[PDB]
Amino acid sequence: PIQQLPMMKGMGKDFKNADYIDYLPVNMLATPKEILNSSGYLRSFPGITKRYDMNGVSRGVEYNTAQNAVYRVCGGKLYKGESEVGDVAGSGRVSMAHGRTSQAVGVNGQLVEYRYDGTVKTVSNWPADSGFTQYELGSVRDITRLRGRYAWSKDGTDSWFITDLEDESHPDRYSAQYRAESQPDGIIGIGTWRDFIVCFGSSTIEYFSLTGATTAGAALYVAQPSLMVQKSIAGTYCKTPFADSYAFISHPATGAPSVYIIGSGQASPIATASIEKIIRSYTAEEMATGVMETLRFDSHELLIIHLPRHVLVYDASSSQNGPQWCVLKTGLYDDVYRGVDFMYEGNQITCGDKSEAVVGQLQFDISSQYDKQQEHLLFTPLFKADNARCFDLEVESSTGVAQYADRLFLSATTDGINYGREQMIEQNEPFVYDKRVLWKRVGRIRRLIGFKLRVITKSPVTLSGCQIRLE
Amino acid sequence: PIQQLPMMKGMGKDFKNADYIDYLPVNMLATPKEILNSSGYLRSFPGITKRYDMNGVSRGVEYNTAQNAVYRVCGGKLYKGESEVGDVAGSGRVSMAHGRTSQAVGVNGQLVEYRYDGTVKTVSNWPADSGFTQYELGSVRDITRLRGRYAWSKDGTDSWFITDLEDESHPDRYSAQYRAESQPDGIIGIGTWRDFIVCFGSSTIEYFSLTGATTAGAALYVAQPSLMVQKSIAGTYCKTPFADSYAFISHPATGAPSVYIIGSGQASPIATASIEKIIRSYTAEEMATGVMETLRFDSHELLIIHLPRHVLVYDASSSQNGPQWCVLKTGLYDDVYRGVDFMYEGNQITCGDKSEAVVGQLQFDISSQYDKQQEHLLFTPLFKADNARCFDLEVESSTGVAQYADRLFLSATTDGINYGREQMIEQNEPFVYDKRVLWKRVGRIRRLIGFKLRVITKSPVTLSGCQIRLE
Amino acid sequence: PIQQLPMMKGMGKDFKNADYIDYLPVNMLATPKEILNSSGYLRSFPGITKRYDMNGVSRGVEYNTAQNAVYRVCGGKLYKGESEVGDVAGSGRVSMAHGRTSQAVGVNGQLVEYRYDGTVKTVSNWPADSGFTQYELGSVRDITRLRGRYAWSKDGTDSWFITDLEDESHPDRYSAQYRAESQPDGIIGIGTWRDFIVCFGSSTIEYFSLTGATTAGAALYVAQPSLMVQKSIAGTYCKTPFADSYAFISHPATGAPSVYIIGSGQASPIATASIEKIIRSYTAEEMATGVMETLRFDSHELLIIHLPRHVLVYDASSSQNGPQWCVLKTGLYDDVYRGVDFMYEGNQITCGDKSEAVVGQLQFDISSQYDKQQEHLLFTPLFKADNARCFDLEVESSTGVAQYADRLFLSATTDGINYGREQMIEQNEPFVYDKRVLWKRVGRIRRLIGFKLRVITKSPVTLSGCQIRLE
Amino acid sequence: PIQQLPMMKGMGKDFKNADYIDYLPVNMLATPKEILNSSGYLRSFPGITKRYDMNGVSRGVEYNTAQNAVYRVCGGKLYKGESEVGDVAGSGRVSMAHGRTSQAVGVNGQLVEYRYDGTVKTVSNWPADSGFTQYELGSVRDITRLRGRYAWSKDGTDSWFITDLEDESHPDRYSAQYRAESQPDGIIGIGTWRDFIVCFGSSTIEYFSLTGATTAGAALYVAQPSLMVQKSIAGTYCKTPFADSYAFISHPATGAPSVYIIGSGQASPIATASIEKIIRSYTAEEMATGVMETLRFDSHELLIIHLPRHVLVYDASSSQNGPQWCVLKTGLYDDVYRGVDFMYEGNQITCGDKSEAVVGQLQFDISSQYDKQQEHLLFTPLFKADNARCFDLEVESSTGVAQYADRLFLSATTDGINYGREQMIEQNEPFVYDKRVLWKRVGRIRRLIGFKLRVITKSPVTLSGCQIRLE
């Protein structure tokens, strides 16, 4: 009785809560492609190779459409491409909003514009003798640009401003004060949808649109109640464009945090039970510092979430049978993924580093990260067979490019928490394309069994449909 | 013939009316997850552990978005998290509506605002010498906030007011009187949905929205007839947000009360026959005092109803095959669940207590409440087998988190009302993860049979698909 | 066990990345027709025969509706049908926009109009003494016509202009400056859809419509935000009408480039994983120079993409089971397809040439291109058969139009990358209409097998359902 | 194994291109009726019998609603039913547009109105001394009427006019010039849909509707961009009403011509591959002269296309399994169908003649045309049977009215192009209603076989489900 075993999502218990939890694939990306005898094949995450050095750790990335080059802020220097093009202060994550005449990075509570000719100007009130309206700027939290104006929100308050059209340094001449007052919620983050200035409050999401008013003093932007979403973003950087909309992480006010996607003025969950438990496992301040972003290559639509001790990835194209989350990791143990701030420039993707002061470019023919080994895990779900035997256990591997015949550790559990002996089986062979990963004499499934495939290698691993002969 | 038995909803007779009624699972939450050989597993409700003390019993909870902390009114003293800010009179349940410059709690018929700098002001008419319009405020019943205004309804009348923008203590300067006059129904409760002030009456649910009028004396809020719902809330606190809308309990005016959800200006029932019989079992005054609320943890979307002698819970995520209701209870006998006013703050949920003067935080690795044993029930539906025999009765359990090998009492009925001998079978074993709960030699199903699984424990119980070998 | 083998899309590994990739049919067009025992038959691309000569290589084509004849710009000379109707400078690809009173070709950064009476005029500002508004025209990138006006976009800037109604040479009298300022994205290309002037930015797509204003100085065109598409075109010529809309290649700013189609203000992908990997294999500049166009004949609605080293073709009518891409090629080795700028005029299609200074007309009864042999490839997908034997391998071919009895080289692989011995089987016989292409004694499939059908001929090859007797 | 053979559409090869093409039923109309053991029965086209004579060949037909009689223009003489009213010059096809006070026929580039009282007036500009606006009428191409105005298009230009309400001879007093300027396409034809004047161009299909303007000089008709269709009619008379819309043939400007139907501002193809191959087999001028029209009788919705060497018919009601086209023909060889300009008047349909100077009325109890024999063909699709035998070959015929026991020629092919021996089997017997058309001992199918049923008769032939005992 040849029975197939899925590997796109593994199951198991949780030894603290005693609840069934999803054992997620690690450093793998399920690809819905009709492979051999199965409907999909697991593909290892692309490796990282150092493109060139950089000052400090990475703090932000933005693809400047105006200059057709990527501006990356690492450490304390606003690197454009590879050449340093300015001095930036601070050490925390900073949000940027590129413009046609100036590239800006909201840092240390002030919106700093790095003009394209070299000079640097900071947002401040119009001069008192000028005669234009004077505001109370406060501290800048998040920024965005839409129709030649920079929109930023005062820190700790629901008010947001817009710059003048003529002189971008100062805010608008007469009407530059706007409030997301539909609820008493402070603006955690701001952004730009299709043509709307969203305002991600601590408990609500509002959409603002230009009214086209001409008379001085008239409110340029008017709220669009019909598009309001009754959720929020947990932290300042827990939002990102994803599939022609913004995904985010619900703020604890509305309830237990959970991933979401805005659709037609409504929030739809895309986080499984295990993902929501993992997110809930964090404290408020730790989870607020998390940042999420979008990465796209091959056929996948990733939504990478950079939590302090986890790096969750949502693969939209592989969600045919349900949400598909893979936990990326760096190193042999449970360390956090080093890659951060992925952006696609020119030919190949480039990513920052959380620990080292380097920038890495994704390379698809290897899985090593900065010339180091990495761990790829695959768990099959628990299935109940009583007094049965299993002998043939074959997984199709795309044997090929490699540096050594890196063997995989294959182990099986019986209670779904702790595992048995680790059996070593060759998975790749350098420059051999027809090896089969086959193990015989698995044994007797007494009550339950779950197989964990663990591969330690510097070369891509492509595991396909898992065949077991449950005789 | 290994035949499975569902446990998400038990069925049986009712010895008073002789009607078939749903025997609901007690202190369990069905989770639609594909586990082993079943499509879902029953999970015990999380236990309650005392976080710290409080003065008196809990009377209200509301997550203050402005201050990013939860304000809880226990006994006669208002609490902001651990610290105490304010004294609140009365003894009954109180409705709160947080504001950006003041936290308010409508109590004893007057809307009392607790300003954030320490001072306390109460809503009253503008001074006579001021010159602004004088109203007849009357007694305050329910309150809400929307766009910087507090909306409260005069007790025993369909009129509701709004406070001034400049000075929030007094009502609006010129236009502060509004009526839900579409029907001769008094406003039982008020609330805010999106940008709409609801006006839950006794036969209708009217919706209002800002008209944006500028001239003095013009009605700021205008009725939206197209969204009217022809039902009502039975009591002042029988409403709550749920799935981007308000659920409620129908007022007896429109017919027998039943749990409803508002959708696109229409009420759709979500209460089964048994739930609505239980609701109808109460008198008008008793069922009016019931309070209902929303709790969201893990992936479930609970809708907890606090009836005087029952605590019904609607699990939205587990309603795939139909509405799923579980009756929570505290203690070994039919006492009412002590947990009340659940709110998620920071990392972990916190709940008040109906009897003691404490606050409890939900803990997921135990099921004990304030270090006390609790009872979990699971009923399988009645099924007709004639002259058949059943031997194997296995219920997969997630053993391992416990303090003692708490055994379960397994009993089977024959007429669906009263049960037979109670058999004790070990359910958990402390820190053993592969125990099976198996019973052989069940007996002969003569005409009908129904199994009641009863667990008394201080640790979580996770029961899965129940199979019986009806040979 | 006679088992059929699809050939509409071949599948296999990739020896560099070790990833499974689609082996696309080469010089084939799947036709969804119920043929004999199969649901579709593979049809060779029509051949190319030299209609007449031309000066230089082909640079553009446009079917002039006003004169009901095709205008083709080859080399440095503009051609109308057979005749030479003006001199055009430059060497790169040129975009044209035919008009009722002039045929124009935006070349070398200036919009040059070739009036129908012989004279040539170039767009320039109105004379200073005229009194009309003076603009900063800059360099012309892309052009289009709509309601008697020529719309062109300033190179390296998001501004686009419109010509005057009375005198088409100069821009509009008072209002001729328009900007796609919704984002800081430069306009990569312009076009006309329905009555809208699109503006393909480097990161966004905007739709413009006439406002019908009469007063002087009022903006004739107003942006239509509701139709915005949040994607972009890779290069100036990476767009074309396709199925009552524009398809394109995504700019690298929004992520990895991938072929898209605009629908109801939303971009829907039509590129499989292999296609977008092939597209990503190119650098930014190389992929910018790519040009794509639409060709429609028989039942196929092709979307031909002219990449520097590949010619991908999307067959809209054959996408029943998923996107269908065929890689056209010229010569025995991997050279790029010579045919370029296809247009249907009169009775038969005509196409330019990338290398020679000739124009070819598509001829359907041959597959030779300019009297040369061409290669047609067909790959069957990899399928897992263990210890099985295959004897009968038959493909139905429509025989008879050939010149000589051309033969096909049939080979089978075992690892999906490199192939075995090439077996030669007669496929057509000149003027015999009932030959069967049958091969016996294929052999034993050890682990995997994939058949490559390679035909070298000067006559059309029509291969139908492939049956293999996997005994 | 009694296996049924469809006859609604036949399959075969094409000896020139070697492509599989549809062998269409000839002079037959598939009727989707559940007959005996089959889902439909083939019915011969109704025959033509001479009602009375006429002068010259037929050039146009239009059912005059105002006079409740059909006006037919044959040769150089205009006819109203039997009687002869007007005199018409020219020799080519003429477009008519009936009016309440005048019947008009656009001929020789001038719109000529035949008033109902006998006088004849031609459209010309208003007299110079009158004072009304003077236009440049030019040559008339196509005409239509809507709300008391005649709309005609200037030949070789996209401008169209409308006549005055008071005096219909001259165009409108102040506003009679209108342009389909959305594209630089000349108006190939004009027509009226509901209350819209279409302006069928050479690359677009623009619409127009009355604006209801009252002031002199205001444009009465304003464009409706939202209904624009981005296709065109190949020739002046390649359009006709069909199923509450206009079907047409695509102009070569947009690609290869193909029969289309306009729906909700979008063109949907209804032409199979073989139909558009037949259409494309014509040159531009030849296919431009084609005229297409609608005929509706019984349950069929015919859409007859009169191409120079083919007469294609689309039967809408029989398109359940896909488009259904039958090629009508006159005579034993490939001559073109003589019937033209079908119109239903009174009790029975009447049709003109392409060659003779007569008018024929359709008669349903015969298939002879003007007392001549006609040929009906039926091809079964090619199906692959190897080493099989077929003995019983029965087709259900509705034997009945006839003049002689007209036998059918039944032949079978082996390569799908050329056929074998013609076997003669009695199909009808005069005055006998229970004959069966049965042939035994068909033979052995070496690889492929296709049966061609050919009937030469002067009486209707009704062939039903064809069964073959493939033993």
Side-chain angles (χ1 to χ4, degrees), chain C residues 89-231:
Chain C
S91 66
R93 295 212 43 113
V94 298
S95 66
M96 311 166 268
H98 72 286
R100 184 151 261 290
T101 175
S102 65
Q103 164 56 295
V105 54
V107 63
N108 269 328
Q110 45 168 5
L111 183 147
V112 174
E113 301 160 49
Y114 291 77
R115 187 159 276 84
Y116 284 121
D117 63 0
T119 183
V120 170
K121 288 199 287 184
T122 302
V123 167
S124 68
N125 295 267
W126 279 92
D129 57 356
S130 66
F132 307 128
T133 301
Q134 296 293 321
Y135 307 103
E136 300 180 353
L137 291 182
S139 286
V140 172
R141 184 178 260 259
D142 208 353
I143 62 170
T144 186
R145 181 188 175 90
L146 187 153
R147 305 200 73 100
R149 311 180 176 277
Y150 278 11
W152 76 90
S153 66
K154 173 145 55 73
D155 190 4
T157 309
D158 51 3
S159 301
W160 60 283
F161 303 71
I162 58 175
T163 68
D164 189 350
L165 261 173
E166 174 181 54
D167 190 319
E168 171 156 349
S169 167
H170 322 301
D172 206 309
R173 278 206 194 59
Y174 302 82
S175 80
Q177 174 93 354
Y178 292 90
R179 293 195 35 121
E181 49 193 355
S182 64
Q183 280 269 309
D185 58 313
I187 280 176
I188 303 290
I190 201 176
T192 181
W193 173 71
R194 308 194 65 85
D195 61 317
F196 299 115
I197 293 281
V198 288
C199 275
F200 296 96
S202 196
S203 159
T204 65
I205 293 176
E206 298 210 284
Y207 289 78
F208 283 113
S209 67
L210 277 80
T211 194
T214 66
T215 181
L220 306 191
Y221 288 67
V222 298
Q224 212 54 28
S226 66
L227 288 171
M228 167 168 285
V229 171
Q230 313 214 90
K231 294 301 190 313

Side-chain angles (χ1 to χ4, degrees), chain D residues 112-331:
Chain D
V112 174
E113 301 160 49
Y114 291 77
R115 187 159 276 83
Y116 284 131
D117 63 0
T119 183
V120 170
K121 288 199 287 184
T122 302
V123 167
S124 68
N125 295 267
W126 279 92
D129 57 356
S130 67
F132 307 128
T133 301
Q134 293 254 330
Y135 307 103
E136 300 179 353
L137 291 182
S139 286
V140 172
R141 184 178 260 259
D142 203 358
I143 63 170
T144 186
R145 181 188 175 90
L146 187 153
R147 305 200 73 100
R149 311 180 176 277
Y150 278 11
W152 76 90
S153 65
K154 173 146 55 73
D155 190 4
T157 309
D158 51 3
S159 301
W160 60 283
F161 303 71
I162 58 175
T163 68
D164 189 350
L165 261 173
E166 172 176 85
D167 190 319
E168 183 178 1
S169 167
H170 322 301
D172 206 309
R173 277 206 194 59
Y174 302 82
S175 80
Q177 174 93 354
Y178 292 90
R179 293 195 35 121
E181 49 193 355
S182 64
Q183 280 269 309
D185 58 312
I187 280 176
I188 302 296
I190 199 177
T192 169
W193 172 69
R194 308 187 60 86
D195 64 313
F196 297 101
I197 300 299
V198 301
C199 294
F200 285 104
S202 185
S203 298
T204 60
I205 297 169
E206 209 165 354
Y207 285 92
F208 282 113
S209 67
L210 276 80
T211 195
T214 66
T215 181
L220 306 191
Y221 288 67
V222 65
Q224 212 54 28
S226 66
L227 288 170
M228 158 172 301
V229 171
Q230 293 179 176
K231 294 283 181 333
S232 173
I233 62 171
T236 299
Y237 295 80
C238 311
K239 71 193 179 299
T240 187
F242 183 73
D244 291 76
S245 293
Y246 290 169
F248 59 99
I249 296 164
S250 179
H251 196 265
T254 69
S258 184
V259 175
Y260 277 177
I261 297 170
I262 297 169
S264 54
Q266 193 178 321
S268 61
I270 69 169
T272 56
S274 164
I275 300 299
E276 164 195 309
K277 283 140 81 63
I278 278 170
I279 276 163
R280 191 201 63 207
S281 174
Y282 289 125
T283 190
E285 311 96 20
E286 277 197 311
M287 183 278 288
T289 66
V291 57
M292 82 174 290
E293 61 182 41
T294 181
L295 172 43
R296 175 191 181 310
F297 63 82
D298 273 20
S299 178
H300 314 97
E301 293 284 321
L302 289 75
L303 164 70
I304 301 170
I305 296 174
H306 285 329
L307 288 189
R309 304 198 309 278
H310 296 76
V311 183
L312 302 163
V313 169
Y314 178 93
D315 187 295
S317 66
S318 170
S319 66
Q320 297 294 321
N321 314 277
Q324 171 77 8
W325 296 75
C326 64
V327 176
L328 271 68
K329 67 184 288 184
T330 300

Side-chain angles (χ1 to χ4, degrees), chain A residues 33-37 41 43 63 65-66 68 98-100 145-148 192-195 244 296-299 301 343-344 346-347 364-365 394 396-401 433-436 460 462 464 467, chain C residues 11 13 15-20 22 156-158 179 181-185 202-203 225-228 230-231 251-253 255-258 260 265 273 276-277 280 282 284 382 384 386 414-415 417 447-448:
Chain A
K33 183 175 176 66
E34 301 256 350
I35 196 64
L36 300 185
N37 269 10
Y41 73 99
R43 164 71 200 190
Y63 193 102
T65 312
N68 210 31
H98 72 286
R100 185 151 201 62
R145 181 188 175 90
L146 187 153
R147 305 200 73 101
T192 181
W193 188 41
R194 309 176 53 81
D195 75 299
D244 291 85
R296 174 181 181 310
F297 62 83
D298 291 331
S299 178
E301 291 265 310
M343 190 50 88
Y344 179 76
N347 189 359
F364 292 102
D365 59 31
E394 158 167 30
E396 313 283 28
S397 63
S398 174
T399 79
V401 298
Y433 307 95
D434 207 338
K435 169 176 297 305
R436 63 198 303 166
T462 295
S464 197
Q467 183 178 2
Chain C
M11 184 177 177
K13 292 184 179 68
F15 65 84
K16 304 153 301 283
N17 304 7
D19 263 8
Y20 302 105
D22 310 345
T157 309
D158 51 3
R179 293 195 35 121
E181 49 193 355
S182 64
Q183 280 269 309
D185 58 313
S202 196
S203 159
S226 66
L227 288 171
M228 167 168 285
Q230 313 214 90
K231 294 301 190 313
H251 196 265
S258 185
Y260 277 177
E276 162 196 327
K277 283 140 81 63
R280 191 201 64 207
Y282 284 138
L382 276 177
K384 184 181 188 300
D386 267 326
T414 314
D415 44 8
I417 297 169
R447 212 175 70 92
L448 314 158

